Symmetry: D2
Subunit: 360 residues, 4 copies
């Protein structure tokens, strides 16, 4: 059932800015994000760790908060002006959503902020005010071989992609790429504000769940180094999928799992989307180059596993099951199909994955 | 067991070229020249002679049109002309069939000896070769995926220790191997030129040629080969990778030519030229040994390999391996692998890593 | 004298989009831009060559036009909507500037367009409508080892940097970085619309002249390959300066010269500037890490040579001499000075360039 | 004749360059350069010495820093194939009439039976086989730096008569891969190898004996860029002497930097294979402006004039003999010099100055 376009104007969203993840063991989480991945500590105490990427000047891109159940607490977007926080509040109130306004913020280093339970059940934050910190972009004395340089995007699991897509377009996101079939089903959509391929994305599945948070590197070798280091630390079992080249987005990528199974993507070298008529690319769901351009198989956990999200009271949001077709099932499941070249039987896969594999 | 001859081994410098029989020369040319960017030293209607960016000898790869795709010769360069005579005396003492051609078997090679070696492989030894323009600074020709050197061969043979002892007597030094706790050897790597290997033995039914490997300068050059194959919509010919190897520590990719000959692209292994270079043995169940990142080894990697020819041009009969199968003990229904030895977390039983089983 | 701020609203400028350069020998220029640099031909005839970068979807990023005197004919910015071309016309008419509007464009592949002789003497174009072409961003079968992936910026030589800066700020560009001294002189300023360090920049000098046009690559090795290729072609004398790391912008860079001496920069890996409170950075003109972070000397031609620009009648604009202090003279001239560490005599240079050189 | 005659005694079989011992004046400041800035790995340290190795090394060290009163090269060490090659080295240099010192338990920690010699060009060479093996760090990506130095690649020596030194090194088994000459018959520089890269040592024409540099490898070109970027961030870009660049000779990507005592260190990657015995030898003309930097960037004058003192076996600085052959600096970038981009083309040539608009400071 369609989400109506408010009469109230949408807040002017700049970009994704930070995520707040609830973690069960703060020290174990710190080891992963600081010792393994090299993120920079803006502040920490016994309850939280505030982390930022190499080129960031706002206070943080990730807040790790100790709690009893691992989950997304907030995905936060920065808006253009202080007045845009009021616009966000009016907009979501018109949508009939639950909102909470804190003039001095929900986390350290953020000022006036609005959190909402959005129409898809996700906890979004909108803020302008943030404490500036030392921008480390030329601190090559600190630069890691695997350095994470920016926060790039979020990716959300939701059962009805077109419903969510309309809502995000009304909010001002522009769809850059999607995955559909020839029977009218949408499996995934990518959408932006900042002029990269995306600031968030929708992946079809049971939800609301958080699929991943993505950080950028400068170069491909930086992503390779993360893999290599994970090998050396004998934690290659925490490499979920990749490294690879995406079809959708054209970015070089890697998916890894934190200690609470929150999925983190490392990402580089997508393209510019800032023109308002940026061409929107649709891939067919059976195209075996759409997710991994090299045709490597998508690991099944990528389609089945994702993080819980919290409501504004701190309780886990109920999951609504997807009724639309499953991307897993139609591509790599027993009745699935994929191709390398459209219309060619040679290099096609029937009821299994590419490269000689089946689902475990 | 293969006895050590009284005759001295020829002094082998390095792997130098492979001669592959291909069924459609134009389709093979597309792959090796248009897709992969190797440089043409000579061609006609019957053969294409190719070399890498930094090579000064005539060629690293000869593609010969023939009825059955197969390895025709894997050639090693020896230090002096007199080493070809040593090779002949050596293989005659071993009781092997040999053929000597004072003017070579292929263009751009002079005095050469071909043998059917004790493992059934067609080896060539030569010194004399026609020098060509070394293209190492020809950056006007340099491809984003440029192949810069020939690095090694990899051979499938059923009894790895038997082959390893023979290659050690021939002067190759083992650098790395894969074994299990119960004393089975699955693979060994061995060198002359001071890299991890010039050839390698992979346990399996043989003789078959597993692959020929070329080097790039950097990891991004290997990524570009993958990217290009996607753009050409031939990603189905990317067999396995890209990855980081455990054994050798090299960044790698395996692709398949039009006759299913497997080619590896490889970079950034380490120096092995000291005579006490430490050997490294990996456990077969270690899921970081072949792909350091734990990505699963695709089953075709263990099962598929190229036929090899005898000196009459006929396919060599295959002898079955009786020792344990690396595929079966790691990714088969009764196999297992680990991330950390002794840890059930991050271990895989009856299937491959990353959530896959065999198709 | 100060350029007034119009009452009329500024057009919403998206980004730098293309340059039109006049060249004297179209075949020799084609060899440089297509055969040496690998740019992609959108259209060509006996009078013009239209070129685009690897990731571009608009018709072109560079038009080479045969003519009698090598010069910049137009520096074009894309605007957000067709209505913004009307806004640009009103804005420049209010400024008292010569304008010319053509509903079907000045070059192939551009529609309704406004060209102006701006207050600094530069031929600016504003357009929205453009012919979309095949985006080559995943055409790795065409990808060069030195592939140019995007148009990044222009750089303009103008005698009075503060005067120009105020004008560009009123027009909506946001200053990201600048170079000044302790006596109130501004030597250069960088300013953006699209969320990178810049879309254009002002370099103090006799003007109007065009200093350079810059294209991006994905990675640093792509820039090194251009150098290597130019060595193999035995045209290393056309490598003007670099490769290096910039202080200002933090980008990896190279400056080369086309057959008519137009300067082309290759550039990669600057940072995100899209937030409205993006911190500005001011460098001192005597800081020897400001232009080349590694302290390599700035070649003197970089300060003295730049391209002629045309007015709307196709005639070369008269050059007005800078009276403010010269960056060349105050840093590497006979009475100049530069430092490695502020206040440290060790690693400072008096009356000469860094690394043991004087001016030839 | 000045020739160094070939001994009748067989040459030791030399594997490769292995380590250098450098005397430094302030051990803590040197440690901060080699460990904290460059990321070399500690094999042993005390208040007098620091022993360091590269990422892929299995022998005990590639560099020994020894506190002393005068910064200088104390020894440039080559590993030999077998224990018996140390005896061969001793007999070889004794036949040449050189001062030798044999220590059956080594001169530095982690090296066993070793011979040091004052060689015929005045350099302190060491030959050894026995060395303490350590953990090879080649897969320790948890320790890998963005600028990681992976191997010791070569030494480079300044000596006044390049042909005289070249013949001596060839007799010792080094093979020349590249050199720089002019049409008048002067040799300015030569590169020579044992291990199958472009070189293990090299001769640069100039006043000597002096040590021009010690060179370490990286995996990739971005690793070298990172060293530069890090030195900028540390505000020690004045210690970047020359580069980064692409060499003509060797085809390697390179950078030259200066340690706290002004010992020059090169970072180097991606030269080519030279192991075949008929490896084609490449001669460049001294006036070719692409021979040293392929992109035609000018060679910094200090690169031609400055180099490190070397010690004799008593720890005293070796007397320096002046070059009488033509100077590479003078004939290329000096007042009466010249260079070209294209041979025979005045366009892209430089006369009485360097390339890119620069004169000598
Ligand atoms: Ca269908
Ligand atoms: Cl994906
Ligand atoms: Cl493997
Ligand atoms: Cl600059
Ligand atoms: Cl040099
Ligand atoms: Fe993503
Ligand atoms: Fe291999
Ligand atoms: Fe620029
Ligand atoms: Fe060197």
């Amino acid at each position: 059932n369609e989400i109506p376009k408010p009469v109230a104007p949408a807040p002017d969203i700049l970009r994704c800015a930070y995520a707040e993840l609830v973690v069960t063991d703060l020290a174990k989480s710190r080891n992963f994000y600081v010792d393994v991945l090299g993120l920079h500590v803006s502040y920490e105490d016994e309850n939280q760790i505030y982390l930022r990427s190499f080129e960031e000047f706002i206070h943080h891109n990730l807040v790790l908060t100790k709690g009893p159940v691992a989950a997304l607490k907030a995905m936060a977007f920065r808006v253009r002006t202080p007045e845009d926080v009021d616009k966000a509040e009016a907009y979501y109130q018109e949508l009939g959503c639950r909102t909470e306004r804190r003039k001095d913020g929900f986390v350290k280093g953020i000022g006036d902020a609005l959190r909402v339970e959005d129409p898809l059940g996700f906890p979004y934050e909108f803020f302008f005010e943030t404490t500036h910190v030392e921008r480390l972009h030329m601190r090559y004395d600190l630069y890691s071989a695997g350095e994470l340089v920016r926060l790039d995007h979020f990716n959300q699991v939701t059962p009805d992609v077109p419903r969510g897509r309309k809502y995000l377009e009304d909010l001002g996101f522009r769809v850059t790429e999607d995955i559909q079939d020839d029977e009218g089903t949408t499996y995934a959509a990518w959408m932006h504000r900042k002029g990269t391929v995306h600031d968030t994305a929708l992946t079809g599945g049971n939800g609301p769940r958080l699929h991943h948070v993505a950080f950028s590197t400068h170069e491909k070798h930086n992503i390779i180094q993360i893999c290599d280091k994970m090998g050396a630390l004998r934690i290659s079992d925490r490499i979920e999928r990749g490294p690879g080249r995406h079809g959708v987005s054209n970015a070089f990528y890697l998916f890894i799992l934190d200690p609470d199974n929150h999925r983190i993507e490392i990402y580089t070298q997508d393209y510019y989307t800032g023109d308002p008529d940026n061409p929107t690319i649709t891939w067919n769901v059976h195209d075996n180059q759409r997710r991994d351009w090299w045709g490597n198989p998508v690991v099944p956990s990528w389609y089945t596993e994702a993080s819980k999200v919290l409501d504004l009271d701190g309780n886990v949001q109920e999951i609504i099951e997807r009724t639309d077709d499953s991307e897993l099932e139609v591509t790599i499941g027993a009745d699935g199909f994929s191709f390398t070249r459209a219309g060619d039987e040679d290099g096609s896969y029937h009821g299994q994955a590419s490269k000689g594999f089946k689902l475990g």
